[model samples]
Target: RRSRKNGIGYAIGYAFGAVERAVLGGSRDYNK
Candidate 1:
């Protein structure tokens, strides 16, 4: 049960990161 909790957290973080990159137009720098 402990490992399952970590797995879900990782998945959520990964999804958020993907959306962030997309919203930034594939760029990491806001001033680019």
Candidate 2:
């Protein structure tokens, strides 16, 4: 078995999504 790794892509994606959520407001996530 091999251990999985989350690279720079993971951080980039997370940061981007966080910013998007913040700018768009928490209502978006609440609706989901």
Candidate 3:
């Protein structure tokens, strides 16, 4: 079930990424 685990991980990452972007106001350069 490696594929299943990968899918779940990807989904979680995507959700977190979306939340981060929203909180950051969609900034292009987060490093600065």
Candidate 4:
């Protein structure tokens, strides 16, 4: 179904975000 594509996109984005947090030390504020 077309909805499946949305799920896949969400998962990929979530994984990328996890990796980003790991590599960047999960920084939430750069101006602090």
Most lDDT-accurate candidate: 4
lDDT by residue (1-32, candidate 3, tens digit) is: 75887887878879997887787785675567
Sliding window of 10 residues with minimal summed lDDT for model 4: 23-32
Clashing pairs in 3: none
Stretches > 4 Å off in candidate 3: 21-32
Give candidate 3's TM-score: 0.35
For residue 25, model 2's alpha carbon misses the true position, in angstroms, by: 7.8
TM-score versus the correct structure, for each prediction: 0.34, 0.33, 0.35, 0.34
Instruction: Order candidates by lDDT, high to low.
Output: 4, 3, 1, 2
lDDT for model 2: 0.69
Query: TM-score of predicted model 1?
Result: 0.34
How far residue 17's Cα lies from its native spot in candidate 3, in Å, is 2.3
* Top-TM-score candidate index: 3
Please tell me which model should have the higher lDDT, number 2 or number 3.
3
Task: Estimate every model's Cα lDDT from 0 to 1.
Answer: 0.76, 0.69, 0.78, 0.79
lDDT of 4 by residue, 1-32 (tens): 76987887879879997887777885665777
lDDT for 4 in candidate 4 is 81
TM-score of model 2 (CA atoms): 0.33
Model 3 weakest 10-residue run by lDDT: 23-32
Q: Where is the poorest 10-residue window by lDDT in model 2?
A: 1-10
State the lDDT of candidate 1 residue by residue for 1-32, as single tens digits: 75977877878778996787678785566665
Pairs that collide, model 4: none
In terms of lDDT, model 4 sits at 0.79
